[PDB]
């Protein structure tokens, strides 16, 4: 359908061209190609629901990418030259095979002699394998996070790289992989909205929510009100080039033991779609010669909350990374092979 | 289709090189200097010429440059044949290297697509690692299986090739010719590692690196850990590598002459080097004078001295002292920031390469910047090894790496911006700086200026600070706005950097009394005297005055008295 949509979009565009008075725009659109990137599809349960009846179907994955291999040139076309008489031949790809012509055929070089392949003069489709850490909206009990190797092609290389919450969609292939048709670097009914507006006009909502966040425990007005507005977030405003500020609060709990503390520490892990119950680290991957990142914990939750218990029993060497994420929300690694500050 | 276009572009390139002589007397009309450049290299025979692309862009209304610019690899032997024909006709063991430079557009490593394969490109960044030079086969002398005839075979920079037919019809075989090295010219071949600069990295992205190849006499010029700009051709390697031909060590006048003729520039400069911070003029003074140094040159003997400014900030928790740290790295191009606690790496670590199992020296935090500011947050939670590596890097303006039997030292110039905190956090006025900073004397020395910040409840400036904080929290407020932007401040920093001022006799006579006044407060030795001497030419460059008067050094004396 993508291959026939490429013909129909060109046909309806030339039907739009012939309906109006125009200049010479037909000289370039006759050979130009246009494609379609469908992304508005429903969610799925990652790679776990991807059974073998779902091969060559569209699929969408929500998560974060961790490693971007350097773009590799693939040869869409190729040049061939007869080294004794110098006539050039351009060949193109077809399901992954490049026929290599054996002997000359022109009239000046009629003799049978061996051709030579030249590449520094041939266009190449760019290809790149990208590591992606997946995290769905719902996860089954006992499931661990997965690392899927996705692969991007031309006009989409260097647009997706490690550090962002990325929604991606494409065709699931088979070792299995996903051939991306689209990436999303950016990110109710009317009766439910009317019920939200009617329940938002009451006075006791400020306590109602603090009572409805955890009805199995006790009151905890200040603590429950703080975790309620902590998950409400606030306002994250930035400048154009050199400034950023996020509405955020880092909370700490201390006092008498054996009360609902761990309950909360689990409840919020059951509310947010991103969080670990405990920082990441850059690595110079030698196979692809590139600075990949490889993580979990806070790094994974570059969104949502992150739960830490036993703060006093934690070491002093790992307190320096939380000293930067208190108000700066950054990771500054200065070690062998990598000097990089990044988002966290 | 380029077989008849190559001879026409060869004729156009040789017409460009033939029709332009030198008529440059009395700064009159302009014409290119290429024939005298060939006449100068006639004695030395290196043949590693430099042709400006801006000087080539005027012919055929730029259309000759645009046609060469996309088909550079397909037109390169025609260009070298036209150069060979013009030096064969204007002049009587023959290798050639044509280098192009000064492109009008500077491209990053993240904007490289497959549409520029084979075209020329300008790549700027920082060198991470280097590979020792090795001979490049280039062209070889093959001998036949029976003819014993010489064939001059030209490689295509891909892999070990082999001919197909013997030229002499004494044989027509295709068996293995044998290689010969006498009649095969060899060019040094180096492979270095270029990486993305710290000021143009995207938010959350990784600084992707790439390997660039280099031949001719462009090798052994690129120094490790220095910002570099290459000009070359994108060549694929069975991976998308690069070939460079030009190397350079990189890293309006109506506004600059207007800004050096007034008298209140320095007062807007101390409040415009950090517009997001309320108060702290002394810290802003040291940060502004810590960007530009001076008088380091050469000692009357033959050893280089420490002509840089070291700045260290201390005080209580929850202050705006890290904001300067976030500003320098967002404004200075020669600025590398590290977290400090999470840090050999600081003093340029060693990593192995499997070809020869040989070591290469990665700059890391310490050697990444050149004539810049390396800023280390949380200086007191670091270990003993990186702090003695910083001390070994600071006594002499050089860093030494001793690994696998080889010892190598190199000139690294940096201005340490050290952010430290006390052992208890709160700064007590009860004792000295040594017991509260909790670090040994040597690593406490070679620091030009210390900035201690203490806070308390003083409502009149506190309400203004809280109002500035809540007024900053909006969409791009004008409250933060400086008296003038950074647009002329960057070229002012560069213009003051290339000034090179000197001291007088009255300044020295006031300096000996100032050193006696600083030592009367007593640790203070020759290093603090060198720090205020280096701050004097920095404030002379910032106020753009050549011969320094002692009245401008009196403000530096007051700055040292304020600390």
Residue B237: CATH number of its domain:
2.40.50.140
Task: For chain B, say whether A179 makes contact (Cβ under 8 Å).
Answer: no
Residue B381 touches chain A, beta carbons under 8 Å: yes
Q: Nearest CA of chain B to the CA of A195: how many Å?
A: 32
Interface A-B, measured as beta-carbon pairs within 8 A, has a size of 156
Q: DSSP assignment, residue B94?
A: -
Q: Is A280 on the interface with B (CB under 8 A)?
A: no
Q: Are B220 and A179 in contact (CB under 8 A)?
A: no
**B32 and B176 fall within a common domain:** no
Query: In this structure, is the dihedral angle defined by the CA atoms of residues B102, B219, A339 and B441, taken in order, positive or negative?
Result: negative
Give the angle A42-A47-A49 at the CA atoms, nearest 5°.
Answer: 65
Strand (E) or helix (H) holding B414: strand B414-419
Taking only Cα atoms into account, the Rg of chain B, rounded to an integer number of angstroms, comes to 29
Burial class of residue A104, CB neighbours in 10 A (0-12, 13-18, 19+) = buried
Nearest CB among B110, B330, B338 relative to A339 is that of B338
Confirm whether residue B315 is marked as ligand binding: yes
DSSP label of B561: H
Test A126 with B114 for CB contact under 8 angstroms. yes
Domain that holds residue B409: 252-563
**Residue B489 touches chain A, beta carbons under 8 Å:** no
Regarding whether B327 and B465 lie in a shared domain, the answer is: yes
CB contact under 8 Å between B364 and A339, yes or no, is yes
B319, closest residue in chain A (CA to CA): A327
What's the Rg (C-alpha) of chain A? 28
**Do B451 and B437 belong together in one domain?**
yes
Report the residue from A88, A157, A164 with minimal CB separation from B204: A164
Do B408 and B359 belong together in one domain? yes
Residue with tokens 């008529």: B23
Provide the strand spans (E) within B64-165.
99-101, 120-129, 134-136, 139-143, 150-154
d(CA A170, CA A152): 10
Q: Is B302 on the interface with A (CB under 8 A)?
A: no
Which of B114, B126, B158, B471 should one mutate to test binding to chain A, selecting the residue with the greatest count of A CBs within 10 A?
A: B114
Residue A6 phi, psi dihedral angles, 5° rounding = -65, -30
Q: With contacts defined as CB-CB under 8 Å, which chain B residues touch A331? A: 339
The two beta strands, B311-315 and B414-419, are: parallel
DSSP labels for A252-304?
---S-SSSTHHHHHHHGGGT-SS--B---EEEEETTTTEEEEE--HHHH-SSS
Q: What three-state secondary structure class fits B59?
A: helix
| Both tokens assigned to B450 | 């210390």
Which residue from A123, A291, A302 is facing B209, i.e. has the nearest CB?
Answer: A291
Based on the domain organization, do B129 and B165 belong to the same domain? no
Partner-chain residue, chosen from A162, A245, A335, that has the shortest CB–CB distance to B205:
A162
Question: Nearest CA to A196 among A186, A204, A205?
Answer: A205
Q: Which residue in A228, A214, A272, A250 sits closest to A322, CA to CA?
A: A250
Residue B344 burial (CB count, 10 A): 17
Query: Residue B68's domain is classified under what CATH number?
Result: 3.30.1640.10
Contact list, A109 vs chain B (CB under 8 Å) = none
CB contact (8 A) between residue A336 and residue B349? yes
Helix (H, G, I), strand (E, B) or coil at A149: strand
Q: Are strands B227-233 and B150-154 parallel, antiparallel or unpaired?
A: unpaired
Residues followed by a gap in chain B, C→N > 2.5 Å: 92, 238, 251, 343, 522
Residue A125 has its nearest CB partner, among B114, B118, B158, at B114
Q: Considering only residues 63 to 122 of chain B, which have any Cβ-Cβ distance to chain A shorter than 8 Å?
A: 73-74, 110-114, 117-118
Residues B80 and B125 placed together within one structural domain of the fold: no
**Can you tell me the distance from the alpha carbon of B70 to that of B117, in angstroms, rounded to the nearest whole number?**
9
How, if at all, do strands B335-338 and B372-376 pair? Answer: parallel
- Tokens at A48, concatenated: 């776990």
Ramachandran assignment for B276, one of left (phi > 0), alpha (psi -120 to 50 degrees), beta (any other): alpha
Task: Give dist(CA B370, CA A56) in Å, integer.
Answer: 53
Note whether B344 contacts A336, CB cutoff 8 Å: yes
* Cβ-based contacts of B210 with chain A (< 8 Å): 70
| Continuous segment of H or E residues that includes residue A229 | helix A221-232
Domain end (from B187, B202, B222): B187
B310 and B173 share one domain: no
Min Cα distance B537 → chain A (Å) is 31
Looking at the structure of chain B, the number of domains it has is 4
* Calpha distance A329→A302 (Å, rounded): 9
Residues B535 and B427 in one domain: yes
Taking alpha carbons only, the member of B283, B284, B306, B278 closest to residue B293 is: B306
Please give the C-alpha separations between residue B89 and each of B9, B14, B18, B33, in angstroms, as whole numbers: 19, 11, 11, 18
Q: Which residues of A touch B349 (CB under 8 A)?
A: 335-337
Give the number of other CB atoms < 10 A from CB of residue B514.
20
In which residue are the tokens 């150069």 written? B83
CA distance B225 to chain A (A): 13
- From B494, B512, B509, select the one nearest B549 (Cα to Cα): B509
CA distance A321 to A344: 10
Residues in A 201-240 with any Cβ partner in B closer than 8 A: 237, 239-240
Q: Are residues B43 and B98 in the same domain?
A: yes
- Whether the Cβ atoms of residue B214 and residue B243 lie closer than 8 Å to each other: yes
For B187, the enclosing helix (H) or strand (E) is strand B187-195
Q: Residues B124, B155: one domain?
A: no
Both tokens assigned to A20: 């109006």
**Gap between the Cα atoms of A58 and A297, Å rounded:** 30
- Assigned token pair, B407: 């010892």
- The closest of B304, B267, B334 to B411, measured between CA atoms, is B304
State how beta strands B99-101 and B50-52 pair. parallel
Indicate the residue among B251, B273, B298 that finishes a domain.
Answer: B251
Task: For residue B203, list chain A residues with Cβ-Cβ distance below 8 A.
Answer: 163, 343
Listed residue (B89, B72, B109) closest to B38, CA to CA: B89
- Cα B351 to Cα B190, B291, B515, distances in angstroms: 18, 31, 45
Q: How far is CA A153 from CA A4, A73, A90, A127, B108, in A?
A: 20, 10, 22, 4, 20
Closest CA to B147 of B178, B164, B163, B168: B168
The answer to whether B289 and B538 are in contact (CB under 8 A) is yes
Q: How far is Cα A279 from Cα A300, in angstroms, rounded to an integer?
A: 9
Taking a C-beta distance cutoff of 8 angstroms, is the pair B185, B139 a contact? Answer: yes
Name which of A119, A125, A342 is nearest B204 (Cβ-Cβ).
A342
Q: What is the CATH number of the domain that holds B313?
A: 3.40.50.300
């Amino acid at each position: 359908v993508i291959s026939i949509m490429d013909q129909t979009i060109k046909d309806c565009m030339v039907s739009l061209i012939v309906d109006n008075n125009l200049d010479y725009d037909l000289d370039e659109i006759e050979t130009k190609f246009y494609k379609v990137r469908p992304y508005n599809v429903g969610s799925c349960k990652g790679m776990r629901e991807l059974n073998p009846n779902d091969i060559d179907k569209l699929i969408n994955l929500k998560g974060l990418v961790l490693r971007s291999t350097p773009v590799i040139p693939d040869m869409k076309v190729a040049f061939f030259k007869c080294n004794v008489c110098d006539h050039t031949m351009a060949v193109e790809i077809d399901r992954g095979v490049i026929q290599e012509p054996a002997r000359c055929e022109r009239i000046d070089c009629n003799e049978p002699n061996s051709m030579s392949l030249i590449h520094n003069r041939c266009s190449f489709a760019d290809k790149q394998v990208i590591k992606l850490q997946e995290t769905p909206d719902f996860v089954p009990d006992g499931q661990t996070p997965h690392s899927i190797s996705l692969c991007v092609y031309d006009e989409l290389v260097d647009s997706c790289r490690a550090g962002d919450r990325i929604e991606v969609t494409g065709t699931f292939r088979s070792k299995t992989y996903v051939d991306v048709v689209h990436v999303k670097k950016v990110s109710i009914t009317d009766q439910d909205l009317a019920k939200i507006r009617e329940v938002a006009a009451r006075e006791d909502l400020y306590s109602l929510l603090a009572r409805s966040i955890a009805p199995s425990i006790y009151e905890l007005e200040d603590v429950k009100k703080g975790i309620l507005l902590q998950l409400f977030g606030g306002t994250n405003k930035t400048f154009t080039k050199g400034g950023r500020y996020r509405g955020d609060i880092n909370i700490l709990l201390c006092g008498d033991p054996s009360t609902s503390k761990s309950q909360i520490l689990q409840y919020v892990h059951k509310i947010t779609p991103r969080g670990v119950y405990t920082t990441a680290y850059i690595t110079r991957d030698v196979d692809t010669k590139q600075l990949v990142l490889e993580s979990g914990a806070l790094v994974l939750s570059d969104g949502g909350v992150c739960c830490i218990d036993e703060f006093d029993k934690m070491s002093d060497s790992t307190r320096s990374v939380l000293h930067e994420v208190m108000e700066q929300q950054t990771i500054s690694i200065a070690k062998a092979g990598i000097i990089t500050t990044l988002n966290a | 289709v380029d077989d008849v276009t190559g001879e026409k572009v060869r004729e156009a390139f040789e017409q460009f090189l033939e029709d332009f002589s030198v008529q440059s007397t009395d700064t009159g009309e302009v014409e290119k200097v290429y024939r005298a450049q060939i006449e100068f290299m006639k004695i030395y025979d290196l043949n590693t010429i430099y042709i400006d692309y801006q000087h080539l862009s005027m012919r055929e209304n730029g259309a000759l440059a645009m046609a060469i610019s996309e088909q550079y690899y397909r037109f390169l032997p025609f260009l070298q044949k036209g150069l060979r024909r013009v030096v064969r006709k204007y002049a009587p063991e023959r290798v050639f290297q044509i280098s192009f430079f000064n492109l009008p557009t500077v491209h990053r490593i993240r904007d490289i697509r497959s549409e520029k394969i084979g075209s020329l490109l300008s790549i700027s960044g920082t060198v991470t690692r280097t590979s020792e030079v090795r001979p490049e086969l280039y062209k070889a002398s093959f001998t036949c299986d029976m003819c014993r005839a010489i064939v001059d075979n030209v490689e295509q920079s891909f892999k070990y090739t082999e001919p197909t037919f013997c030229p002499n019809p004494s044989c027509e075989n295709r068996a293995f010719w044998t290689l010969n090295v006498t009649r095969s010219r060899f060019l040094d071949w180096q492979k270095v590692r270029i990486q993305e600069n710290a000021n143009e990295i995207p938010t959350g992205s990784m600084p992707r690196t790439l390997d660039v190849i280099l031949r001719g006499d462009s090798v052994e010029r690129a120094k490790p850990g220095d910002r570099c700009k290459f000009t070359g051709v994108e060549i694929v390697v069975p991976k998308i590598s690069f070939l460079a031909c030009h190397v350079i060590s990189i890293g309006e006048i109506n506004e600059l002459k207007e800004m050096v003729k007034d008298e209140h520039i320095y007062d807007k400069l101390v409040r415009s080097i950090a517009p997001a911070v309320f108060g702290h003029e002394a810290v802003k003074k040291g940060i502004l004078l810590q960007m530009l140094g001076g008088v380091h040159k050469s000692t009357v003997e033959g050893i280089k001295l420490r002509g840089d400014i070291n700045i260290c900030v201390v005080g209580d928790p929850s202050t705006s002292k890290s904001q300067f740290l976030k500003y320098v790295v967002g404004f200075a191009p020669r600025s590398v920031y590290t977290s400090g606690k999470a840090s050999a790496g600081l003093t340029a670590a060693v990593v192995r390469d499997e070809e020869g199992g040989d070591y290469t020296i990665e700059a890391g935090a310490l050697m990444l910047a050149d004539n810049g500011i390396c800023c280390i947050d949380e200086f007191d939670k670091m270990d003993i090894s990186d702090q003695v590596a910083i001390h070994e890097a600071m006594e002499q303006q050089t860093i030494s790496i001793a690994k696998a039997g080889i010892h190598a030292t190199l000139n690294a110039r940096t201005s340490i911006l050290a952010a430290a905190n006390p052992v208890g956090g709160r700064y007590n006025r009860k004792l000295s700086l040594r017991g509260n900073l909790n670090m040994t004397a040597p690593i406490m020395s070679r620091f030009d200026l210390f900035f201690v910040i203490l806070d308390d409840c003083n409502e009149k400036i506190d309400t203004e600070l809280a109002s500035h904080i809540v007024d900053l929290h909006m969409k791009r407020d004008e409250a933060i706005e400086p008296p003038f932007s950074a647009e002329q401040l960057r070229r002012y920093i560069k213009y003051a950097r290339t000034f090179k001022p000197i001291l007088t006799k009255e300044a020295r006579s006031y300096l000996v009394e100032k050193y006696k006044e600083l030592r009367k407060d007593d640790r203070i030795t020759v290093r603090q005297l060198e720090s205020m001497i280096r701050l004097s030419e920095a404030i002379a460059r910032a106020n753009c005055v050549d011969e320094i008067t002692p009245s401008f050094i009196a403000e530096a004396y007051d700055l040292l008295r304020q600390s």
